[PDB]
């Protein structure tokens, strides 16, 4: 995030980090329950990638983080790589996440929900802070 | 790339207003936000754009794409969860 700020540790419990086997953070995601995380289809997550939960500082070795394995990747059948439309992919975890004060689920809207233009919402992540 | 989790609040825009920056690339299952002095950037993809509805943070969009230099002056583009939630329900319900 460019021009963002540091979050309070553990305040966005659903935020997970998708890392490859190298340990490299390549995409973020959100826990929707103990067995499912939602991310972008264009991240290209495979089953050899890992989902890290309860993490705040990627440089800390003293955080009680959860390294969860992916059982199966579910790419939205409507996903269009040419237009990047319907960019959503579900991850079924082989290992179930254990919810705690720092690990829990974000809510999903109903198909009917409307969020008016002008509404101030929030986005989180470990993406570049400046290009 | 930051070691510690970042956050930023930003306004949601209408697709028609967003089409002024992005044109025809803005599809219906997309929702823009930003052009407010902050901007999602590379490595944030897949992450949440949450809005507080009735006391709880609800997943409104998923970081997808936007400006190649993460210009804080142009809106980022997120997958619109309302247009996708039915597929999520179906997928969870069958596995």
């Amino acid at each position: 995030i460019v021009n963002g700020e540091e979050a309070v540790p553990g305040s966005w419990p659903w935020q997970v980090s998708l890392q490859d086997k190298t340990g490299f953070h390549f995409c973020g995601g959100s826990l929707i329950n103990e067995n499912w995380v939602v991310t972008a289809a264009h991240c290209g997550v495979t089953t050899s990638d890992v989902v890290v939960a309860g993490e705040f500082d990627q440089g800390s070795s003293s955080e009680k983080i959860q390294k969860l394995k992916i059982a199966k990747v579910f790419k939205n059948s409507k996903y269009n790589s040419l237009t990047i439309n319907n960019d959503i992919t579900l991850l079924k975890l082989s290992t179930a996440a254990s919810f705690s004060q720092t690990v829990s689920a974000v809510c999903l809207p109903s198909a009917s929900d409307d969020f008016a233009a002008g509404t101030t919402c929030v986005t989180t992540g470990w993406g570049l802070t400046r290009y | 790339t930051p070691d510690r989790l970042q956050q930023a609040s930003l306004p949601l825009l209408s697709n028609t207003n967003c089409k002024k920056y992005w044109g025809t690339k803005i599809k219906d299952a997309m929702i823009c936000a930003g052009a407010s002095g902050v901007s999602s950037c590379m490595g944030d993809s897949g992450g949440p754009l949450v809005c507080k509805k009735n006391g709880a943070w609800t997943l409104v969009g998923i970081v997808s794409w936007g400006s190649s230099t993460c210009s804080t002056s142009t809106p980022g583009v997120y997958a619109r969860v309302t247009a996708l939630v039915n597929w999520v329900q179906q997928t969870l319900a069958a596995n």
Partner: peptide
């Protein structure tokens, strides 16, 4: 869902 045990500070 959607209500952190450690509330966000914006």
């Amino acid at each position: 869902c959607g209500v952190p045990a450690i509330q966000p500070v914006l």
